[PDB]
Amino acid sequence: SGLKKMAQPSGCVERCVVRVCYGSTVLNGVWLGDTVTCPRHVIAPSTTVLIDYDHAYSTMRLHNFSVSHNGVFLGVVGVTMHGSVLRIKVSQSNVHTPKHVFKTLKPGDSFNILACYEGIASGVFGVNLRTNFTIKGSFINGACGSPGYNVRNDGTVEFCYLHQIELGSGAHVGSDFTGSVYGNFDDQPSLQVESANLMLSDNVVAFLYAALLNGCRWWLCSTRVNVDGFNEWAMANGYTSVSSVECYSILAAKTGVSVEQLLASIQHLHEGFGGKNILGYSSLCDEFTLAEVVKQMYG
Amino acid sequence: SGLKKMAQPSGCVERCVVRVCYGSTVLNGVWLGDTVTCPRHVIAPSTTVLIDYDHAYSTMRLHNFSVSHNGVFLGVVGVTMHGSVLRIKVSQSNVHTPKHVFKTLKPGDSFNILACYEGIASGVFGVNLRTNFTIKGSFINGACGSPGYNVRNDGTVEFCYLHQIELGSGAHVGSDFTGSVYGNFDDQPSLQVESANLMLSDNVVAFLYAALLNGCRWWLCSTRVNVDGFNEWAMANGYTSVSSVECYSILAAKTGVSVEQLLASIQHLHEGFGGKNILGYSSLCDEFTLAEVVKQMYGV
Amino acid sequence: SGLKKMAQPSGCVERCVVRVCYGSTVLNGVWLGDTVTCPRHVIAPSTTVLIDYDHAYSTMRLHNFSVSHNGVFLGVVGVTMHGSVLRIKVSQSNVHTPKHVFKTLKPGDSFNILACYEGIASGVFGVNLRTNFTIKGSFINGACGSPGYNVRNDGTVEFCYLHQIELGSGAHVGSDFTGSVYGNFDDQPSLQVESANLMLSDNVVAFLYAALLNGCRWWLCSTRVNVDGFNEWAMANGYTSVSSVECYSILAAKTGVSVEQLLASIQHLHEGFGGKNILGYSSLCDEFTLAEVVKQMYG
Amino acid sequence: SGLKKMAQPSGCVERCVVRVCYGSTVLNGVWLGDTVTCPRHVIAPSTTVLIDYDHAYSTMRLHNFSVSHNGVFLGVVGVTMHGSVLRIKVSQSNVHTPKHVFKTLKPGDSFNILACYEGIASGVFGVNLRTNFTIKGSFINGACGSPGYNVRNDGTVEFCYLHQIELGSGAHVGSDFTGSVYGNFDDQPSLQVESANLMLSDNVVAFLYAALLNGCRWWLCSTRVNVDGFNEWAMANGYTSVSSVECYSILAAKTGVSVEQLLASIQHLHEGFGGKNILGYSSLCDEFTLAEVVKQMYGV
Amino acid sequence: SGLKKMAQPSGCVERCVVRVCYGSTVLNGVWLGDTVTCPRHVIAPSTTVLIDYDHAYSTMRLHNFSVSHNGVFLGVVGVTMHGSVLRIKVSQSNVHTPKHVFKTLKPGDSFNILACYEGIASGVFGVNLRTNFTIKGSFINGACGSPGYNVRNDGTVEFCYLHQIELGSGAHVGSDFTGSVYGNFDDQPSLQVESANLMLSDNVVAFLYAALLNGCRWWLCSTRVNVDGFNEWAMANGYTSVSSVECYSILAAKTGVSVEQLLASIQHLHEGFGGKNILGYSSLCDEFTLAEVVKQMYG
Amino acid sequence: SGLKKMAQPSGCVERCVVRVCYGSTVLNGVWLGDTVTCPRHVIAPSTTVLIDYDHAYSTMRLHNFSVSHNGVFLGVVGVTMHGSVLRIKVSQSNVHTPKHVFKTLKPGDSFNILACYEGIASGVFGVNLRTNFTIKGSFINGACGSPGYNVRNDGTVEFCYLHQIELGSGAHVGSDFTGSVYGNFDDQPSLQVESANLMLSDNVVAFLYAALLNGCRWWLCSTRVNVDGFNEWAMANGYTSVSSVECYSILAAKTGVSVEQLLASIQHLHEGFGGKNILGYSSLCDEFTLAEVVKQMYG
Ligand SMILES: *[C@](O)(C(=O)NCc1ccccc1)[C@H](C[C@@H]1CCNC1=O)NC(=O)OC(C)(C)C
Ligand SMILES: *[C@](O)(C(=O)NCc1ccccc1)[C@H](C[C@@H]1CCNC1=O)NC(=O)OC(C)(C)C
Ligand SMILES: *[C@](O)(C(=O)NCc1ccccc1)[C@H](C[C@@H]1CCNC1=O)NC(=O)OC(C)(C)C
Ligand SMILES: *[C@](O)(C(=O)NCc1ccccc1)[C@H](C[C@@H]1CCNC1=O)NC(=O)OC(C)(C)C
Ligand SMILES: *[C@](O)(C(=O)NCc1ccccc1)[C@H](C[C@@H]1CCNC1=O)NC(=O)OC(C)(C)C
Ligand SMILES: *[C@](O)(C(=O)NCc1ccccc1)[C@H](C[C@@H]1CCNC1=O)NC(=O)OC(C)(C)C
């Protein structure tokens, strides 16, 4: 038993992480086959003033790149630019390239971040793409290029994020591997401001089912609210809508509690726990998806 | 910026994980050199009734073991018993053995757990050894033998935990690699009970410093309390003592806030946050050590 | 066990109730010694238009009064006017006059109303003087003059109310037996408007102690709030201040719960019960005083 | 205007209350003519273990009774036992005996309780006989024998209840004056259990009419449900059936709202009031009968 | 020290008991999630004549059910029939539902009965399922539906019995939660007769070990008998076979007495104690399992 | 039918048990309101040598206590000493505190023990206080502080025992909640020895009535002995006196057998059963009170 926000194992991805240097700027990239993807601001002349990327790419020279994996140098043969990333073609193919795919995340998807500095993984953690297209991570100077990923049941890695920016709020933004920045933020120093985050209602429901199944039941109200009424309340109170109730049928059956009862319980619990807790959390938790709760409780 | 509970990368440890089967019991072990360490209850005839380990070891037959790494079988040469673990000698040396050490944790030490099932890592997360010698993890049937570890700045892996049991409370207990069970729990089905979980005051201080440095400062009260007064309060309110204030001198200097101000702020915040939060946490957080906060805020 | 809003027994007061008629207006009065007290608007010429009481009293004639007790006529000898009541001197002294006193209620005092029509008691109920100097009763045309009372432990009746008016809101106002109208309302048809009622915090505390002592404990929060903080919250949320915590020391000792914990629990519970109940009440109850809870639980 | 749960005046009944003592057991009785009715467990040797009433009556001695009214002793002449009560014949006839009748209540009937201790009335309150033959009163040790009553329009007192016990739930049970216990509970210490308390739908309808007539109308939905559909819903949701709609014709006419609209409104309101209230009640109220609402709104 | 037949604590089960009424028949049921399990004879038209259950279920009407807990209504949505039980789907989910599973007992398993009347727990005691598929309990009219259970170390309740009948011998029979009656007895008034009970030899061995460990050793013979010989004797003398001697290894080691010596001692003690006793018992005791003895001596 | 030694259900008590640690000594305590009662030997420096309790209490330091429930901290505010118990005033009030009272048992009273270890209930069983002020329980190291209790019909818990010691005989002694040790034993390691137990004659009579009512009548003699004669015999043969015959009136009436016949039957049965049994017991049983037999036969 227990519920803990965890990352999927990082080995297959650590083998793809490299150090990318242009001039005196250092950040990370990801080496899959004979291509290294990294953020394009590695060739920026400054990163404090507004950047003409067209100019920086046109005047870029290959002899200024140095790309290495655990100190072993890779030979750069060429570079193309795709939105906010570079694809650096190199001589050597990564023999530890895992079976993989590129995937673009949607709000509410969970994934894993491998935080890297100078080409070396430092830390690994699970996170959710928020409704405002940011994440709440922990990154300092040098982290750009840290990858995000999921690993499917068949062993296939979905590469889905590369760290790009920290907004003024402290919230974090990346791009996918096509170079689209999540939420169309700009990979520029700017005064951009994210929308206010919405609590992910589907996760909050999953979490309350997990609480029931771990014998924590004090918070359960005996009121019912239907989907359309919860969704109206949600808009007013900083919560997403809830997805089809059929998703939860296995857990509804195992607990004998319907989604509608949990929705009403959320409405009440939003006002405060009154000093009590739920699986140790002193307020509602949207950190875990349905899939994560099910995987952690049952495999 | 930001503060997030992370694990150290798991690759060097995933290469040491194996599936250990005895009879029809399956769990995990850790393959370093030509030795696989695993929990000794893999040879128990039943995990429901009290176990005679002497009898289980005396009647043990090697031909009942099967040990594999990513489906490749390993040849079992012999087995010794050390407290709550077995050391299974095998023919093949793990060529991916990292440079390593065995280390025994102390309350308040942070470490990483690689949760495993059937010899295959499933997830990885950071955790703290609590005052009562347990951790709060997430483990289900099959997790026994999941390792815990730290990686030093030089690349050296400290192997420090092997998962052994879940207490009736839900709290988790392991052994070190010498087979000592943390907190002297028993690797037996029983009704054994942990002592009280105390909030780790050193971590709470670290965390509030992290909050200040991420511009979260609403909670800061303008009272001071000294160490000895906080420590007396702590005993009565479910908190450890705090270690010498000069530990925090770098962060005191960078924020302009003294530990004594934070201690007072803890006393206030103990009563509840009201509606508000600190780095998203709706109550005080003892999940981060000083070292972790420093590493996440500044590096090295 | 149980907690029920009750009245003190009405016999000693029913023996003092009389029918007072002037002209064609009938209402009730209270016969103590050789005096009957009743509301002065019994001599009003209309009660729909504004009343000159000075004129109505000056032109009043004794031969227009008829005063009776269970159909037995009383001889009227004279009438004086004191604020909003008349004191009608009669020949016969009420031989069933109980030992009594006049007392003026303060907000938060509980008392009993004997609702009367044509000199005859119809109903009896307990009520509280609210912070806005009204009560919430049930009275129709004819009820004026219904008395309110308390009975002390020694058998002494405190006469403390005589029904006078229903405000536009439906809230009820009376006078004491000196003729002062509670809250200085006017005994006239008017557009007067009471202040908004404050929930009586002292009673809410008493009630939660009663809930603890009847084994109802689900609502108890493990937060504490001190007096001064509760009092600030109260002002903002429609509640009185709380009186000295020492009042509750017996019940604090018997339950092991301090007032401060109950104050915090009130703050939480104000937001809604979430479909649960406390001694059958689906929201906080200020209907019972400390004295009433103690008397009903222990004698 | 307004609606408040009231008792009928208690004077004519207070004059019939007496203190009944047998041995060292004290409770209340009711003195009508030359007979005092009281609960038969006054002669029980112990209220802790199962009671042999046959034995207690056979070994009873008259000289152990003492009966008084406001401290004036009454002479005990004899005692018979009728179900769960005694009829104690006394020398003096109660000169304040009101004109009266004995009546047995049915579920849903309202009545009044005069709570008494040691022969002295302490409080008075209105109450309803529930579907499970209990009431919710407030009684402590010494209340047994407290009477319940109604007073007809002609002045005739119906004596209908004598308090006998508190069940483990806290619910209260009495007998009528013939000694039948309501709901056939036993006047024995036991673990006996009431059936489910059902909301009295007729009263709930009355109450909503009262709300409309006091200008409280926010809750009124513009759906209709007929009797047979409401009655099916009721069974599933903890409500009685509703009696024929024409009972409410006067109030339907005065408000312009039909019963069917109220039935639908009940179905909606069952789900919760939200923040709001109805005549101050934060949930549906079945405390008032049709007759009570009519009497409080219009008289006679 | 000492040895006493105990029950596992009953709190987690107590709050799952409810009162189930059909017509004028009242018994108990068990409320887990939004389902109440109870014996199907609650819908029997008469407990004196043979019952056509198929007919009684087909003609059953929902409006005849009344389900409550301590006077609180619980609404019936539907009913299915599974062997000798009904599953009553109900409106509210039991908020005190423990983590649980259903398990079917085997002869020799110990468990706990929570004896209940009208939905209320009265008593709790440990008991063994006998070789003849009965138990020896204490149940009177109203006990039907009393549950039996075990509690695992993690707090998980195994629900394993529901009381169904008393045979003409006074022996007691229940079903599991699937509706299978233990021993295929019939949930009908009948003249069915259980096989003769066999003494549980494994428990008798455990009991003698407990006696040794409590310093009671007067009975110990210097005979040895092996498993195969004891098992042959057992058949002839009203005893089960004995399990492997290895089961007893901890206790054999701690006492220095082998199973084989205890088996012989059973054969001798079978003939009578000669007025002496063992832990106060005047004849051999099969009430305690090995697990119980081990838990009580070492825990 | 049947007769089985039962415990009253343990839920209301279970949630009052806590783990109390001083130094390295761990035992149980009972948490009611904001007070934890536990045996004072938790502060003993050594359980092998004579203990100066006055000194141990005077030198006791609060910082050495650690009080928890299932790992949840509970803070110590202060400690007083009352006979053989400590009253530990604590920071939190037990929200699961039942309605309760303290009661001191008399010899022959039945009650329930909730056997506990490290703050956790393990077992529950019914037991009698013997004439020698001991009980025969089953307790090992760690059981100290296990509570004993009775539950009245209204749900009110009578707390009446706290486990303190095991005598050299194996017999068990506790204190009440005031700190008086039953029988004035000492809460010290010692060579104290209980008086010889007297068979509880009142219970033996109850037991024979239960046997009659379960159709077991082979033992019934056609001798009568009156109270005074039985009482004289009892003194000589290890039995208490018997109470008034009137106590048994219900059961005398239902069986048609008088107490006097049972008293004689006890005198005969004292000599041995001759290989027969009564409700399965091979000798006379004083385990059940009259109240228990009546509850189990009629309820
Ligand atoms: C990022 O570009 C980065 O990590 N760059 C390498 C680097 C090396 C030394 C010193 C500074 C930067 C950077 C990461 C941010 C900064 C702090 N936390 C973060 O997540 N992004 C960045 O600078 O964004 C723009 C678009 C302004 C270049
Ligand atoms: C542990 O031994 C384990 O994971 N065993 C393998 C297994 C496989 C299938 C079914 C059951 C067990 C176990 C881990 C627990 C279970 C729930 N969460 C955990 O952390 N511990 C365990 O069984 O230990 C003792 C000492 C009781 C054998
Ligand atoms: C009140 O004066 C009263 O009861 N008067 C006698 C009466 C007889 C017949 C018809 C009307 C009145 C009256 C009571 C009010 C009205 C309804 N509910 C009440 O509480 N008060 C009253 O009229 O107030 C003023 C000051 C306007 C006279
Ligand atoms: C009731 O008999 C009673 O009031 N008895 C007098 C008394 C005096 C002192 C101490 C105890 C009892 C009693 C009333 C109950 C108690 C709590 N609330 C009530 O309504 N009922 C009662 O005892 O009935 C039986 C049948 C058990 C004797
Ligand atoms: C069981 O049906 C029961 O408890 N029923 C409630 C009941 C009892 C009497 C009259 C109406 C309703 C009952 C339990 C038995 C009775 C005596 N001791 C027991 O264990 N079962 C029962 O009578 O069995 C059949 C199958 C015949 C209905
Ligand atoms: C009781 O003190 C106890 O349970 N203590 C916890 C403990 C046990 C052993 C070592 C350290 C701490 C104990 C209960 C006895 C022991 C065996 N069976 C029992 O009932 N009491 C005890 O040992 O008594 C004295 C008064 C000598 C301390």
XYZ file of C-alpha atoms in Angstrom, chain B:
300
model
C 14.132 27.836 -9.322
C 11.545 25.567 -7.615
C 11.750 22.684 -5.166
C 10.627 19.159 -6.049
C 11.250 15.849 -4.375
C 13.437 13.906 -6.731
C 15.313 10.683 -6.922
C 18.878 10.360 -8.096
C 19.054 8.661 -11.457
C 18.467 4.937 -11.334
C 20.500 3.493 -14.262
C 23.561 2.199 -12.419
C 21.187 0.402 -9.956
C 18.766 -0.990 -12.533
C 21.670 -2.947 -13.982
C 22.036 -4.725 -10.604
C 18.437 -5.830 -10.200
C 17.466 -9.482 -10.502
C 14.563 -11.839 -10.104
C 15.029 -14.386 -7.290
C 12.817 -17.383 -7.137
C 12.801 -20.118 -4.477
C 10.155 -22.750 -4.964
C 7.158 -20.711 -5.976
C 8.137 -17.520 -3.992
C 9.396 -14.649 -6.179
C 11.027 -11.402 -5.104
C 13.918 -9.159 -6.076
C 17.606 -9.210 -5.335
C 20.670 -7.097 -6.016
C 23.604 -8.493 -8.039
C 26.965 -7.002 -7.176
C 30.145 -8.896 -8.225
C 29.250 -12.611 -7.992
C 26.798 -12.130 -5.110
C 23.053 -11.559 -5.130
C 21.592 -10.093 -1.929
C 17.908 -10.685 -1.243
C 15.566 -10.955 1.709
C 15.786 -14.274 3.503
C 12.068 -14.873 3.579
C 12.300 -16.019 -0.031
C 13.114 -19.481 1.575
C 10.256 -19.274 4.060
C 7.690 -22.029 3.618
C 4.778 -19.680 4.454
C 4.595 -15.882 5.046
C 1.348 -16.316 7.194
C 2.647 -18.172 10.371
C 5.806 -17.550 12.480
C 8.947 -18.670 10.554
C 11.759 -20.911 11.773
C 14.703 -19.504 9.811
C 17.151 -22.101 11.207
C 14.913 -24.904 9.887
C 14.317 -23.157 6.540
C 18.049 -22.684 5.966
C 18.915 -26.265 7.090
C 16.317 -27.789 4.780
C 17.090 -25.384 1.925
C 18.174 -26.972 -1.392
C 20.105 -24.993 -4.019
C 18.292 -26.692 -6.902
C 15.102 -24.831 -5.820
C 16.620 -21.362 -6.517
C 16.338 -19.703 -9.944
C 17.974 -16.338 -10.370
C 17.768 -14.223 -13.607
C 18.663 -10.748 -14.960
C 16.330 -9.485 -17.718
C 15.381 -13.142 -18.412
C 19.045 -14.479 -18.623
C 19.581 -17.224 -16.024
C 22.420 -17.082 -13.515
C 24.008 -20.212 -12.006
C 23.552 -20.581 -8.251
C 26.780 -21.752 -6.525
C 25.873 -21.213 -2.833
C 23.979 -19.331 -0.148
C 24.795 -17.893 3.212
C 22.346 -16.128 5.625
C 23.183 -12.771 7.253
C 20.551 -11.439 9.602
C 17.494 -10.858 7.403
C 19.206 -11.358 3.998
C 20.677 -14.169 1.899
C 23.938 -13.812 -0.020
C 23.556 -16.014 -3.017
C 26.849 -16.743 -4.699
C 26.475 -17.078 -8.492
C 28.851 -18.206 -11.309
C 28.751 -14.962 -13.296
C 30.122 -11.678 -12.015
C 27.864 -8.627 -12.847
C 29.943 -6.790 -15.394
C 27.808 -3.657 -14.760
C 28.714 -3.617 -11.074
C 29.178 0.055 -10.149
C 31.816 1.269 -7.737
C 30.047 0.929 -4.410
C 29.929 0.788 -0.694
C 27.432 -0.521 1.884
C 26.140 2.170 4.177
C 23.675 2.067 7.070
C 21.248 5.031 7.229
C 20.400 7.090 10.307
C 17.115 8.816 10.996
C 16.793 11.919 8.907
C 19.011 10.638 6.071
C 17.472 10.957 2.606
C 17.840 8.211 0.011
C 16.292 6.755 -3.131
C 14.147 3.725 -3.619
C 13.988 1.776 -6.850
C 10.727 -0.115 -6.637
C 10.966 -3.458 -8.393
C 8.710 -6.385 -9.252
C 9.907 -9.746 -10.618
C 13.427 -8.388 -11.117
C 12.324 -5.350 -13.157
C 12.346 -1.766 -11.943
C 8.953 -0.083 -12.069
C 9.494 3.308 -10.405
C 11.928 5.475 -8.524
C 11.459 7.976 -5.778
C 13.274 9.854 -3.036
C 12.437 9.209 0.623
C 13.655 9.896 4.182
C 14.384 7.524 7.002
C 12.021 8.664 9.732
C 12.697 8.950 13.469
C 10.914 5.666 13.937
C 13.142 3.848 11.432
C 10.411 3.459 8.820
C 9.737 5.108 5.492
C 6.581 6.003 3.654
C 6.858 4.407 0.275
C 4.494 2.803 -2.129
C 5.018 -0.915 -2.400
C 2.728 -3.875 -3.113
C 3.164 -7.664 -3.219
C 6.380 -8.466 -5.008
C 8.337 -5.390 -3.947
C 10.484 -7.143 -1.346
C 14.071 -6.789 -2.247
C 13.637 -3.392 -3.910
C 16.867 -1.513 -3.196
C 17.523 1.877 -1.710
C 20.628 3.873 -2.567
C 22.502 7.126 -2.662
C 25.067 8.203 -5.242
C 27.978 10.250 -3.961
C 29.525 13.193 -5.884
C 32.376 10.861 -6.992
C 29.882 8.350 -8.659
C 30.137 5.771 -5.815
C 26.833 4.053 -5.026
C 25.902 3.606 -1.355
C 23.591 0.626 -1.137
C 21.604 1.222 2.023
C 18.187 -0.513 2.007
C 16.409 -3.609 0.865
C 12.708 -3.685 1.224
C 11.452 -6.266 3.750
C 8.021 -5.371 5.120
C 4.908 -3.355 5.454
C 3.727 -2.851 9.058
C 0.040 -2.811 9.973
C 0.137 0.966 9.903
C 1.214 0.967 6.185
C 4.717 2.118 7.097
C 7.627 0.434 5.334
C 10.723 -1.254 6.726
C 13.873 -2.570 5.164
C 17.243 -3.935 6.109
C 20.716 -2.751 5.207
C 22.952 -4.998 3.111
C 24.503 -6.585 6.241
C 20.976 -7.917 7.048
C 20.274 -5.594 10.035
C 16.658 -4.557 9.959
C 16.272 -0.804 10.497
C 14.820 -0.119 13.908
C 15.161 -3.800 14.895
C 11.836 -4.812 13.463
C 11.446 -8.476 12.718
C 11.156 -9.985 9.291
C 8.207 -11.994 10.468
C 4.439 -11.572 10.016
C 3.455 -9.911 13.286
C 1.555 -7.059 14.851
C 4.719 -5.027 15.507
C 4.301 -1.281 15.860
C 6.499 1.706 15.045
C 7.158 4.539 17.479
C 5.844 8.005 16.804
C 6.770 9.751 13.620
C 8.386 13.086 14.583
C 8.596 16.066 12.130
C 12.266 16.534 11.220
C 12.925 20.094 12.337
C 16.183 20.445 10.402
C 14.377 19.745 7.167
C 11.535 22.069 8.003
C 14.071 24.851 8.497
C 15.702 24.036 5.136
C 12.345 24.068 3.463
C 11.426 27.514 4.821
C 14.743 28.857 3.606
C 13.874 27.410 0.177
C 10.523 29.143 0.354
C 12.170 32.527 1.073
C 14.590 32.105 -1.807
C 11.655 31.320 -4.169
C 9.898 34.568 -3.048
C 7.298 32.839 -0.803
C 7.455 34.968 2.388
C 3.866 35.600 3.599
C 4.273 33.172 6.553
C 7.381 34.830 8.006
C 6.652 36.170 11.494
C 8.820 38.834 13.110
C 9.272 36.933 16.394
C 12.554 35.160 17.408
C 12.849 31.935 19.460
C 16.272 30.489 20.399
C 17.349 26.844 19.897
C 16.863 25.660 23.507
C 13.316 27.132 23.644
C 12.322 25.675 20.280
C 13.754 22.277 21.392
C 11.553 22.279 24.496
C 8.531 23.259 22.464
C 9.427 20.478 19.922
C 9.221 17.659 22.450
C 5.737 18.723 23.378
C 4.530 19.221 19.785
C 5.871 16.288 17.716
C 9.096 17.714 16.298
C 12.720 16.794 16.682
C 15.263 19.098 18.082
C 17.048 21.366 15.701
C 20.824 20.981 15.066
C 23.261 23.813 15.639
C 22.164 27.059 13.907
C 25.542 27.603 12.142
C 24.659 24.730 9.668
C 22.327 27.260 8.028
C 24.772 30.209 7.849
C 24.972 30.367 4.026
C 21.176 30.486 3.691
C 20.790 32.901 6.658
C 23.239 35.205 4.879
C 21.514 34.853 1.454
C 18.008 35.577 2.825
C 18.836 37.898 5.687
C 16.666 35.686 7.980
C 18.098 33.944 11.025
C 17.202 30.421 12.106
C 15.632 31.822 15.281
C 13.072 33.700 13.161
C 12.262 30.501 11.314
C 11.877 28.547 14.565
C 9.288 31.083 15.715
C 7.646 30.940 12.335
C 7.409 27.097 12.734
C 5.645 27.508 16.101
C 3.068 29.802 14.432
C 2.642 27.659 11.294
C 2.103 24.501 13.358
C -1.430 25.923 14.072
C -2.467 25.707 10.348
C -1.783 27.640 7.131
C -5.287 29.161 6.989
C -6.204 28.920 3.297
C -2.661 29.527 2.065
C 0.332 27.432 0.902
C 4.147 27.356 0.826
C 5.668 26.169 -2.458
C 2.285 24.433 -2.968
C 2.331 22.527 0.363
C -0.749 23.080 2.527
C 1.216 22.138 5.764
C 4.820 22.225 6.943
C 7.104 19.986 4.885
C 10.006 17.945 6.346
C 10.599 16.053 3.074
C 13.839 18.034 2.129
C 17.236 18.067 3.758
C 19.539 21.037 3.962
C 21.817 19.377 1.396
C 18.901 18.758 -0.972
C 17.688 22.352 -0.729
C 21.202 23.661 -1.331
C 21.736 21.320 -4.324
C 18.371 22.276 -5.898
C 18.861 26.071 -5.330
C 22.581 26.367 -6.253
C 24.159 22.987 -7.598
C 27.248 20.783 -6.510
